[PDB]
């Protein structure tokens, strides 16, 4: 029936269509009253979409880090591996720092003041520094998962992944066999969650329509200018990452920047369209071959780099956090800003390569910096940046793929003779 044709039609196009019609309906219903009608009928559809994304946070956070830590563990890291791993972490750290600078320059979301319940967001008291540091170690690992504590879950997931790698290098056959079965079971869980993510994005066009209609009807056209600055900040941030960071690195190691861009045109263009790193990987592997990279070099960095390296996602997270904080009216302190850098890098490592995966991993940063999503004011602000995720997703994927190709160039140059 008609249900079929809705599926094969491109997902990215459907979300874009929902955004346009949702805005127009809100403005038409902006006048003539009927604002209460949108709040009581249209709104519950939007809340269903939000609850689906919140469900996927905890299982992905635990499973992705265990698999990720077991691939970059020092036990199984070779001479080529340690060089490429150091490259990934350093570039990601600089990327989120650049996003913080861009957010301050534009100050997105400052104009809007939202109080859904008639009470503005009240910042919570901050415990002493020693208490915060000691609470990273979970007393009960099972209790952290059940209570939705993010930071304690990060600590347990990483150490569990590293421990399994040492077991797989043991001498006892039974010990090694047990380790592989445990890792496969966790890996199977992680892959299953990404399939659910794809299913949710099919419902996104309906969910985006409800969220935009509610926002435009109440706040008004003032939102359009505010969201415009967010989109401008990210894309201007991304183009600086290509020019300021990648180009100078090529100059230092002697790689021609202009020639590099010409060869990598095919990989960059397809990544923009599909907005998925996994889909771009066969094309990305193909492009490196013409460049003269050794087969062994790009058969390891590119597979690992596709998921481990996501500089564009990290820059997106840094800017998104400031927009939510400014919208609520709160101000991020120096300590919280430093916390963003650490959390954003970890969130990028665990983020999936499927379109729209960045939104789910944004909950990690919000919890860490002291902005819980349970607060209705936060949930309102989280809804707007969620609606425009389709536009920002295209730009993020291009930078992620470009970094992987660039990183291999230096490693191949250095490893060779
Ligand atoms: N589309 C991104 C993931 C994301 O931004 O959620 C990638 O595949 O690298
Ligand atoms: Na990186
Ligand atoms: Na990547
Ligand atoms: Na990742």
Author numbering: 2 to 418
What do the paper's sentences say?
The model protein in this study is a 134 kDa membrane aspartate/sodium symporter, GltPh, which undergoes complex conformational transitions to transport aspartate and coupled sodium ions across the membrane. As an archaeal homologue of human glutamate transporters, it harnesses energy from sodium gradients to transport aspartate via an “elevator” mechanism.
The RSMR mutations accelerate transitions between the OFS and IFS20,31 and substrate uptake by ∼8-fold. We flash-froze cryo-EM grids of RSMR-M385C-mET preincubated in 500 mM NaCl and 2 mM aspartate at 4, 15, and 30 °C. After data processing, 3D classification of protomers imaged at 4 °C revealed that ∼87% of them fell into IFS classes with variable orientations of the transport domain relative to the scaffold. The main structural difference between them is that the transport domain packs more tightly against the scaffold in IFS-A but leans away and leaves a detergent-filled gap in IFS-B. Similar structures were observed crystallographically and termed “locked” and “unlocked”, respectively. We observed a temperature-dependent correlated population increase of the main S3 resonance and the cryo-EM IFS-A structural ensemble and a corresponding decrease in the S6 resonance and the IFS-B ensemble.
